[PDB]
Amino acid sequence: NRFVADWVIERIRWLLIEILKASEDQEYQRLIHSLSNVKNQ
């Protein structure tokens, strides 16, 4: 992104998947498998 600086891009997605962890099956796994780096899990 180029909005502020590298702060609310990945932290928001990380906390979103964290909320998903706290509270579907194939999509709940797609959302985390899609973004770790390229290889992590």
Place this chain on the structure above:
Amino acid sequence: NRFVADWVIERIRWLLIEILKASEDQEYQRLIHSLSNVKNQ
């Protein structure tokens, strides 16, 4: 600063002293002498 990132802090002051150059005597020199790095002019 910690507002966006290192973009509108020094550019704005530089263009402001540039406008002053384009359009006082002791203060017009104080405004530029006060901020170059610590030593430049």
Place this chain on the structure above:
Amino acid sequence: DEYVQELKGLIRKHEFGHQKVTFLSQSPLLTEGFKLLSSLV
């Protein structure tokens, strides 16, 4: 006024709401610019 108008697009890349508005809606340009810089820092 050649650099007076471009500021209206430069500062938008950023709470000093009242000062930001009075900067977007204006001889006093150097004074308000230095005031805004001092306020933000």
